[PDB]
Design a protein around this ligand. Structure first.
Ligand SMILES: NC(=O)c1ccc[n+]([C@@H]2O[C@H](COP(=O)([O-])OP(=O)(O)OC[C@H]3O[C@@H](n4cnc5c(N)ncnc54)[C@H](OP(=O)(O)O)[C@@H]3O)[C@@H](O)[C@H]2O)c1
Ligand SMILES: NC(=O)c1ccc[n+]([C@@H]2O[C@H](COP(=O)([O-])OP(=O)(O)OC[C@H]3O[C@@H](n4cnc5c(N)ncnc54)[C@H](OP(=O)(O)O)[C@@H]3O)[C@@H](O)[C@H]2O)c1
Ligand code: NA
Ligand code: NA
Lengths: 516, 516
C-alpha cells in the first residue's frame, strides 16, 4: 500500500455560497427523510425486530428523526456468532487488504459528508460547524488507522537474534469485542472505536447511544457499501444497561471499547475484571470517561484571546464535550479583566434550533436538560450566578449559557461533570495556586493555559496533570494524528485515540523460534 | 548514553575446573551465612520487624537457609509513603540517569553471580545450570530494560504537525505500584518485574514469594549498593494473601505487576478492576499466570532430538516452570518411537540434593510435594502410570520423573497445571488432531513442535495458539530480547517480558500543544 501522507479532513465553516447551498440541500433532504426506520445490521444483513428505538429532534422533540430496531439478548447472541465466525477469516486478511477496505469506507464517508453533518444537526442538536468537525474527525480516524495499522504488519517486532535460529515475533488481533459509544460524538467516536480494532483484524459488535441511533445506522450503511465481510462489523442499537451490560459481562466477549460517563465506565471496568463462567481469557477494557476541564489564565495573558478561547471551549456544542472548559481559573490580576470579557462575549451567544446554525443548539434530551438544570440549582447555593442559569422558551431543550463566579474549588459544580453550558469561575492568588486547583479533581482529561510567561507555560507542561493540554488556544477539538487524545485519573484508561499506540491495544504478540 | 549493543549473559555450564571451583567456593560462603537475618528495605534503609519469616532448604528442610523480617499493613503503609515520596522526584530524572542506575545494578549483580546461583541452589533447589540460567536472565532484564527505556525518552511520540503550533506528545510514568513475585524464578522474574517499571520512572514495592525471601533480600543488597534513591525500590517479604492483597486492593496503589498462579492472578485482576474507596484512577494490573504446555511430535521428526528436548522441557527444575512441557502429544506414527526414547532418557535422570548438581533437585516445599503427589493419585485414575510416580527417600522433597500415558485430552492431569515432574502423554491420529488437542486447554503460554515437515511447522506458526512457540528445540528458557515472553488466554495478560513493548505498560501519554 502506498497512499498520500495523512492529512486532516478540512472542517467546513460554511462561509462560501457553495458550502451554504450544499448544506441547505443536505438539511432539506434529511428533514424530508424524518421517520425513516433502520434495522440492526448483523452478519452482513439488515435485520429488523418487533421492538424499536425512537430518536427525537432535541430542537423540536415532537419530531421523530427516525427509529431503529432494538437489540436484546437473542440479537446480541446472533451478533456474537457472526462476529466470531467472521474473525476466523478476517484475522488472516493481509493488512494491506484490510487497510484498503478502510480507505474505501473513508472515501464513501467523504462523499456523504453533508448528509451526515445534517443528520447530526437534527439528531443531536449540533450547529453546522460542530457537525462538520464531528464528521471530519470520523473520516480522519478511518484514514489515520488505515495507515497506522500497516506499522504493525507481519512480522513487526524488533527482537535480538540468536545463533542457529530464526526468532520471529508478530502481532495478532484479539477476537470479537463490543464497542459502546456516546451520543455527543456519534459519528466520530462511534467510527473511531469501531475501525481501529477492525483495521488490525478484530471484529466488532457496536452499540450506539440511544439518542444517536439514526446517525449510527448511516455509518453502517457506509460500512455495508464499502464491503466489510459479513460479521466483521455489527450494529446493535439498544439499551446500554440491558444489551450493553449483557455483552460486557459475556464470557465470549474478548474486549470492550467504551467511551461515556465515569459512572458507566466504572461498572464496565469492574465487570471486565471478572471471569464470567466458562470465560477463557482476561478481558481487555478501554474506558474513556468524563472530564472536569479547566482553563487557567494569568495576568500576563492576551485577555481578549483568552476570553474568546474560553467561550469556544465552554459553550461549543452546548458544553456537551468531555473536553469542554467547565472551569475557568483566574489569578488575581486576571480575574476582573478576563471575567468581564468572558461575560460580554457569552451574553452575545445565540441559542435556537440547530438547523438555524445558532451559536448553541439545545442540549440532547429531556433527561440531560433535567440534569443540567438540577446542577444549576445546586450551583446557586455554592457560587454566585452572574449569567444565564435558565431554560429558555420553546419545545426544544434550550438552556442559556451560564456562568457562576467565586466558586469554591471543592463545590459540587467545581468537581462534578455537568455536561451542559455551565462555566464555574474560580479566583486564585497566583499561578501555583491555579495549578493546585486545576489538579484537584478526580479527572485529568483536557486543560489549557493562557499566559505569555514562558516559565508558567513550561511549568504547566510538567505539572498540569491532564492528558491533553493546550497553550493560548481552545481546549476542545483535538485533531486526529496531531493531538493523541485521552486522559489521566478518572478520565479513563489513557487509550490515546488518533495515535499509533491506539492499535496496539487491540493486538497480542506471539514469538516463534525455529532451531535449524 | 552509549553502551555496547545488548547481548545475553552467557549461561555457565561448569565444564571448566575454574567454574566448578568458583561454584564450590560460593556454595561454601552461602551455607556459612545460613544464620543470617535480612530485614525489610523501606525508604533506602533496612528496617526490621518483631515477627519473622523462615526459609528452608528443600533438599534438607530441617536446615534453615535464612530468616527475614515480615511486613504487615503498617510496613505496607510505610513503603507506600516512601514510594510516593520518591516518585515525585524519581519521575523527573533524565532517562539516561535512570538507565545508568540500572546498568550499575547489572554490573553489581554480574560480580555476585556465583553467590546468587548458590543461594538459588540452597533456597529453592535449583541444580547448578538452572541456577546460572536464572541469574543470567536477571542480568539480562536489567541490561535490556536499561536500553529499551531510552526508546521512550522525552518526547518520543510521532505526531502529525499543524500550522502555527508546536504539538508535543511524550510518556510519563504512572506512580508507585506493587510487584508480587513467584518462587520459581526468584532472581530473574523478581528482578525483571521490579526494574522494568522503575527504569521509566515508576517506584515499586516488591513482595517476594515466601519460599524465596533470602535470595530476594540479596537482590535488594545489590539495589542498595547501586544507589537507587530512598523509596524507589522497597522490599516487603510477607504473606501474599495478607500484605500482598492489602496492596492490590489499596486505593493508592497505581499498578500491580504479578507473576504466579492462575488462582491468585484471577483474584488480583478482579480486585484491580474495582474502585477502592477514595481511589482516583483506573488501576493497571499485569498478571502472568500458569501454562499447560504441550510439545507435539509427528512421524517426520528427528525422534532422538525430540526425546532429548521433551525430557529437558518436562523435567528441568523438576517441571516447576510456567513454560514446562507437561503434555506430550504424539501422532500415531510418532507414538512408539518417541515414547520409548523419552522413557529411556527419563529413567536415567538423577534426583537428589540440588547442590550435587543432579538432573533434578527436590520440589520446593512440603506444600508443593503434597500438590504433586495428589496429582499423581488423580493421574492413576485417568491415565496409565509408566514411570516414576513416587516420593524418593530422604527428608528433602524428592519426587521421581513421572510419565502417564494414554491420557485423555480432557483429563484433569491433561488440563490442570501440576507444576511438578509429571508428563502426560496423549496419542492422536494426525497433525490436525495434535493441534486441536494442543489448543484445547484454558491456557496458552508455551508450546513446541518437533517435525521436519515445513507445512506442519508453518501451520503451527499460524494455529498453535500459544505466546511462545518453539520448533525442533526445548520450550523452556526463553531468552530476554530474543523471545518476548508471555501468553494468551488464562496464561495471563500478554505482558511480553524482555521486549520493547513491556515498558509501555508502565507509561501513560500526555499531548501538549502551543499555539504561537
Ligand atoms: N473521554 C472521552 O474521549 C469521551 C468522549 C465522549 C464522551 N465522553 C463522556 O461520555 C459522557 C456522555 O455520553 P453518554 O451520556 O452517552 O454516556 P453514558 O450514559 O455513560 O452512555 C455511554 C454508552 O454506554 C451505554 N450504557 C449505559 N449504561 C451502560 C451499562 N451499564 N453497561 C454498558 N453500557 C451502558 C449507553 O447506552 P444508552 O444510550 O442506552 O444509555 C451508551 O451507549 C460524558 O460523561 C462524557 O464526558 C467521554
Ligand atoms: N506466566 C509466567 O511468566 C510465570 C512465571 C513463573 C511462574 N508462574 C506461575 O507461578 C505459579 C507458581 O508460583 P507461586 O506458587 O509463587 O504462585 P502463587 O501461589 O500464585 O504466589 C505468587 C505470589 O503471589 C503471592 N500471593 C498469594 N496469594 C495472594 C493474594 N491473594 N494476593 C496477592 N498476592 C498473593 C504469593 O505470596 P506467598 O508466597 O506469601 O503465598 C507470591 O508472592 C505457577 O502457576 C506458575 O506457572 C508464571
Ligand atoms: Na435524538
Ligand atoms: Na526455601
Amino acid at each position: 500500500m502506498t497512499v498520500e501522507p495523512f492529512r486532516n479532513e478540512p472542517i467546513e465553516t460554511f462561509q462560501t455560497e457553495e458550502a451554504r447551498r450544499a448544506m441547505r440541500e443536505a438539511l432539506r433532504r434529511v428533514r424530508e427523510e424524518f421517520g425513516r426506520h433502520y434495522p440492526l445490521y448483523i452478519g452482513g444483513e439488515w435485520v429488523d425486530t418487533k421492538e424499536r428505538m425512537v430518536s427525537l429532534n432535541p430542537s423540536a422533540p415532537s419530531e421523530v428523526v427516525g427509529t431503529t430496531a432494538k437489540a436484546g439478548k437473542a440479537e446480541a447472541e446472533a451478533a456474537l456468532e457472526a462476529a466470531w465466525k467472521a474473525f476466523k477469516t478476517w484475522k488472516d486478511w493481509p493488512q494491506e487488504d484490510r487497510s484498503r477496505l478502510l480507505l474505501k469506507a473513508a472515501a464513501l464517508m467523504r462523499r456523504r459528508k453533508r448528509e451526515l453533518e445534517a443528520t447530526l444537526v437534527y439528531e443531536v442538536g449540533k450547529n453546522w460547524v460542530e457537525a462538520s468537525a464531528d464528521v471530519a474527525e470520523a473520516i480522519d480516524f478511518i484514514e489515520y488507522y488505515a495507515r497506522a495499522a500497516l506499522r504493525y504488519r507481519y512480522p513487526a517486532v524488533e527482537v535480538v537474534p540468536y545463533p542457529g535460529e530464526d526468532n520471529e515475533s508478530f502481532y495478532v488481533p484479539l477476537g470479537a469485542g463490543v464497542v459502546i459509544a456516546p451520543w455527543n460524538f456519534p459519528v466520530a467516536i462511534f467510527t473511531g472505536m469501531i475501525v481501529g480494532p477492525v483495521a488490525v483484524g478484530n471484529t466488532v459488535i457496536a452499540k450506539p447511544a440511544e439518542d444517536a441511533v439514526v446517525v449510527g445506522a448511516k455509518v453502517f450503511e457506509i460500512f455495508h457499501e464499502a464491503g466489510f465481510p459479513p460479521g466483521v462489523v455489527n450494529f446493535l442499537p439498544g439499551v446500554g444497561e440491558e444489551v450493553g451490560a449483557y455483552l460486557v459481562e459475556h464470557p465470549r466477549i474478548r474486549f470492550i471499547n467504551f467511551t461515556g460517563s465515569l459512572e458507566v465506565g466504572l461498572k464496565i471496568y469492574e465487570a471486565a475484571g471478572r471471569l464470567a463462567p466458562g470465560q477463557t481469557w482476561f478481558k481487555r477494557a478501554y474506558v474513556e470517561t468524563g472530564g472536569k476541564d479547566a482553563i487557567i489564565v494569568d495576568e500576563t495573558a492576551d485577555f481578549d484571546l483568552a476570553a474568546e478561547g474560553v467561550v469556544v471551549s465552554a459553550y461549543g456544542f452546548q458544553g456537551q464535550k468531555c473536553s469542554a472548559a467547565s472551569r475557568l481559573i483566574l489569578t488575581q490580576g486576571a480575574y476582573e479583566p478576563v471575567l468581564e470579557r468572558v461575560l460580554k462575549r457569552a451574553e452575545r451567544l445565540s441559542v435556537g434550533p440547530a438547523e438555524e446554525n445558532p451559536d448553541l443548539g439545545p442540549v440532547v434530551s429531556a433527561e440531560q436538560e433535567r440534569k443540567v438544570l438540577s446542577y444549576i440549582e445546586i450551583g446557586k447555593n455554592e457560587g454566585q450566578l452572574v449569567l444565564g442559569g435558565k431554560r429558555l422558551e420553546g419545545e426544544g431543550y434550550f438552556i442559556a449559557p451560564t456562568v457562576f463566579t467565586e466558586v469554591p474549588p471543592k463545590a459540587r459544580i467545581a468537581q462534578e461533570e455537568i455536561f451542559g453550558p455551565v462555566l464555574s469561575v474560580i479566583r486564585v492568588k497566583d499561578f501555583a495556586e491555579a495549578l493546585e486547583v486545576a489538579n484537584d479533581t478526580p479527572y485529568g482529561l483536557t486543560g489549557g493555559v493562557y499566559s505569555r510567561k514562558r516559565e508558567h507555560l513550561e511549568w504547566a507542561r510538567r505539572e498540569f496533570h491532564v492528558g491533553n493540554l493546550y497553550f493560548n488556544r481552545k481546549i476542545t477539538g483535538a485533531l486526529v494524528g496531531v493531538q493523541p487524545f485521552g486522559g489521566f485519573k478518572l478520565s479513563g484508561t489513557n487509550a490515546k485515540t488518533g495515535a499509533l499506540d491506539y492499535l496496539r491495544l487491540f493486538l497480542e504478540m506471539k514469538a516463534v523460534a525455529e532451531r535449524f
